[PDB]
Design a protein around this nucleic acid. Structure first.
Lengths: 97, 81, 94, 108, 132, 94, 108, 81, 96
DNA sequence: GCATATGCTAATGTGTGCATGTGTGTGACTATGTGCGCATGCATGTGCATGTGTGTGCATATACGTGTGTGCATGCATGTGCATATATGTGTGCACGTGTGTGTGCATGTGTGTGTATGTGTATATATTAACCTGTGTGCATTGTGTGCATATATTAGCATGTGTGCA
DNA sequence: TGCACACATGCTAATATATGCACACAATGCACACAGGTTAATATATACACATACACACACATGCACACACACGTGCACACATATATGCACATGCATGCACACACGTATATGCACACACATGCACATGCATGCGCACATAGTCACACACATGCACACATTAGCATATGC
């Protein structure tokens, strides 16, 4: 059976997901996450449908930008796989700590 | 609504990393990413809820999120502000 | 009620630079967001400029200085020319 | 009275001079607003809008599209060095990112 | 050319130093071994002093002996401190001149000889039989 | 002419927390910058809050919400308690 | 009439309530300023001043110093988790840095 | 004023700044890179400070002009007014 | 003669300069650099003495904070020596 | 009996050929792209209408030009001595290469939870209307605040001692 | 363990910086009087949450093996530490221009109030560019096969040690 070598289809996904603009997190689980977090601030909180979409758009943009910075840290360390210390370094330099 | 952070699945985190240009991902990234997103959401939602209280509303609107994001230096376009 | 936006003015500008190109509603919202954002930045900087100089009025001079402070190199130079040309043309016709 | 001429037409602008003047007055920026301040500000806003729309229209034309979508605005802003600086801390909804793969990650 | 006579003169002087120093040829081989690691047998030293070895070998052992005679003069105390198998193998010939390794292992186990020893002896058997 | 600063008021606050501790002129300038910076941050946030809600008055409610938005968690809680206590005492006395 | 007493004394504050009201009115923040707004703002400013000054006075005492200097203000802010967050983008002149050496650089 | 004053930021001065930053070992190419970074930082701050000075119709750059320029760039500085 | 091992004097200098608050760049060379850069924007500019002091305070604070971020990048790459690529990565992540 | 000379043959060595391994240059396999055909819903153009920008005097106050005096920034000249630059030696950290285990990517099969549509009841955000309380505005009395000076404290600069760590 | 180097410590004079004081004055407070922004109560339309249903694409788990990361070792030159000569920054004064700030008269310009049109937003179709899906060309993967380059091994030549023969 045909098998692509490791990293070959990973590069295909990079090209695919950098061409498109759709949200990459499933909408319903993210909506449940937003409501769960807002419970610690209020009870009986309702959300506009566009409010959750705005939160998801900002959340995915923030995470994608973080992964771009995380990737540079991994490459700086002469690696190709991102690790939690790469994320920790990027947030520390960014001041998100 | 209990333990919804696991709704951010491994394939979802991998797709976000692919858009960020990441080629290889360690197995410990997924739990680290969930904690990062959890912290980010708390900061925005806390400010967005604070805007909701001042308006004496019980519904979080898109403008409340937009104002909360703007306050944190994360201006978002396309939702009325 | 009526919700004012810049959509009809953005559409007029779009027909000037691209007469055959349309714009989506989501893209129009982003353009409306961009105009309000830039307006608030310039007006805020101009407001501080009047306060730093103990002035009570915002004039085209304050707007010109705010534009130079907020805009990058070539954008500021061309924006200042458009603002000056419009002001010169405006006072020529009252 | 004479025929009512809009201040935008007097200044040769498409953006509303009168609305910008009112927004400046009620925006709590200063207790007075000069006559030329809204004209200057409206012209600057019109110029910046034209810069983005022209670049976004070119991006839409490249992708064989007749309608500008958020993706074309994102491509226009991020591919322009000066626009990217102005909107460096701004997220455009449904805009995506710029295609960029580090050369070290490419196969040899 | 004159390397022949120069070797001969060196060898005569080498014999004189060996006789003067009170070292046997086996002792010379032992000293060469403990000072270089390539211990040589007394037959080689005999064939040297009598100039029996070949020219290439002559030149090859010139430097070691030069070094030993130039070094040992300082201090000496510390420096000092079968036929039936043949017949059986011949019987194994006259029927299969070049056996396989599969048979070679059996032959080695049968006569109690090392595999490498039997292989080299087989090669030299072939060699001397192909001489004629 | 007369230059206005918070130096005299910062000094009175210092004499309560640390009655026998002085302050240098350079450190007093930093404290003056800190008070002005926090004032502008809170007043700016309160001003935006009124505009968002179509209000023309900055009240203590706008100030309280601005404090919660700008100050970190436990700092905001004590600041809100201090502000509420002062407004209650101010109203009870006048 | 009656003997005039400041609103700071009415609110039990040391920061100038009357001056904060004038700074709010002339600061171009809103058309009107409520009576309670300057009182609330002055109390918050006084509390934040007291929090930093009491921490800076502790740093001065730790250094056997009776006078607070910019170093003591910097030490108080950076050693306090919340005050460091509030002044994260703030540079204190002549304040220096916190003593901090990465353990990898320490001798083996 | 003069010309080529970036060399006035000497290697020992750059080393002292790195020591305050907790840097143990410094490569020889750091000093040229540090000078370029400082020049870029100073060009941005001074350009805005002169813009504030020009608006005030002054010929003298004041501390407040520098403070406003630094605040404009998100680098607010305490201790100069 | 007595000789300290490489990095021993460097560690002492780190402790020495992380304890003090004085400006680490010479004042007169920095003033000349400020005036030379300013001459590209206006001719015959004057500076208040505290204006140059404010510039030097912010410049040194900016550089020290950058070196702190640069040091973390070098350690991340399992090094102890900062390199120009360490500065470039730190400025890239910061958004500069 | 030990130490030399012989005959003789294991053993290697020169030289080499095959055999094995690695690298490079393409059939099958897969996946992205390109038209082609078609329905959808979403953008666009067309009218009500109403709220807002405009034209018009009108009064008011901010800003501006003029002059003024004073701080202050610039330039110069002098002096010590601290820091800088240069060179020398060397330790050690960086980078390179090697190898190995295992963690990660790829692919497969399975089911389940997401996305879409549908509908409904309910909570609620919104708008209207009346009124009233609070903030502004104005003027006057005046007390607190900043400026400019005395005054004396803490801070800073030396000099012997007192550890305290590094380093061989 | 002992030596040498660096930072610290109780110690005394010296000073410049902070502290306290007295005075005018400008801003705060006090007292009205007005008015409009805000509140509150009501009604209304909105759109959010809740449930229900379906089909299916995605998520989950597994098995497999590739190659990446991490440890290891090597060597080298780069950078640290040091010494020495020296440039020059720091401090200190002195003088002068000169720009900045104050003060003031005052016209220009902006807010104010009001009538009134018209430009803008909501609502209304409407058709058209985008999305959806089928087939087909097409770039790419890689895997597989072939060719080339390179070590043991062995074809024959050299080599050197054994057993026994001689000899001192």
């Amino acid at each position: 059976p045909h098998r692509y070598r490791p990293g070959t289809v990973a590069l295909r996904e990079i090209r695919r997901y950098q061409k498109s603009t759709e949200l990459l997190i499933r909408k319903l689980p993210f909506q449940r996450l937003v409501r769960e977090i807002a419970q610690d601030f209020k009870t009986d909180l309702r959300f506009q449908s566009s409010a959750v979409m705005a939160l998801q758009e900002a959340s995915e943009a923030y995470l994608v930008a973080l992964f771009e910075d995380t990737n540079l840290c991994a490459i700086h360390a002469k690696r190709v796989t991102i690790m939690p210390k790469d994320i920790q370094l990027a947030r520390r330099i960014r001041g998100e700590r | 609504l209990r333990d919804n952070i696991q709704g951010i699945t491994k394939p979802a985190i991998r797709r976000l990393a692919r858009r960020g240009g990441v080629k290889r991902i360690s197995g410990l990234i997924y739990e680290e990413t969930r904690g990062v997103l959890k912290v980010f959401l708390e900061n925005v939602i806390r400010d967005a809820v604070t805007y909701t209280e001042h308006a004496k509303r019980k519904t979080v609107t898109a403008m409340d999120v937009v104002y909360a994001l703007k306050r944190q230096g994360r201006t978002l376009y396309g939702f009325g502000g | 009620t009526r919700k004012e936006s810049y959509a009809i003015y953005v559409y007029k500008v779009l027909k000037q630079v691209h007469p055959d190109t349309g714009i989506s509603s989501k893209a129009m919202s982003i353009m409306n967001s961009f105009v309000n954002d830039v307006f608030e930045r310039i007006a805020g900087e101009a407001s501080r400029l009047a306060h730093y100089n103990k002035r009570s009025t915002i004039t085209s001079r304050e707007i010109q200085t705010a534009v130079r402070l907020l805009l990058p190199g070539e954008l500021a130079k061309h924006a200042v020319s458009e603002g000056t040309k419009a002001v010169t043309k405006y006072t020529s016709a009252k | 009275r004479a025929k009512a001429k809009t201040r935008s037409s007097r200044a040769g602008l498409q953006f509303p001079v009168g609305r910008v003047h009112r927004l400046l007055r009620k925006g709590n920026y200063a207790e007075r607003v000069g006559a030329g301040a809204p004209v200057y500000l409206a012209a600057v806003l019109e110029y910046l809008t034209a810069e983005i729309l022209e670049l976004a229209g070119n991006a839409a034309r490249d992708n064989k599209k007749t309608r500008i979508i958020p993706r074309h605005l994102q491509l226009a802003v991020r591919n322009d060095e000066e626009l990217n600086k102005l909107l460096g801390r701004v997220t455009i909804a449904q805009g995506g990112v710029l295609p960029n793969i580090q050369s070290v990650l490419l196969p040899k | 050319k004159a390397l022949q006579k120069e070797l001969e003169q060196f060898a005569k002087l080498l014999k004189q130093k060996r006789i003067t120093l009170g070292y046997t040829q086996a002792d010379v081989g032992l000293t060469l071994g403990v000072l270089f690691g390539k211990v040589f047998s007394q037959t080689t030293i005999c064939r040297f002093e009598a100039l029996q070895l070949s020219f290439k070998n002559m030149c090859k052992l010139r430097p070691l002996l030069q070094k030993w005679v130039e070094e040992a003069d300082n201090n000496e105390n510390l420096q000092e401190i079968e036929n039936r198998v043949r017949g059986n193998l011949e019987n194994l010939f006259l029927q299969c001149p070049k056996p396989t390794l599969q048979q070679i292992s059996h032959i080695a186990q049968q006569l109690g000889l090392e595999k490498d020893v039997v292989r080299v002896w087989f090669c030299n058997r072939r060699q001397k039989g192909k001489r004629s």
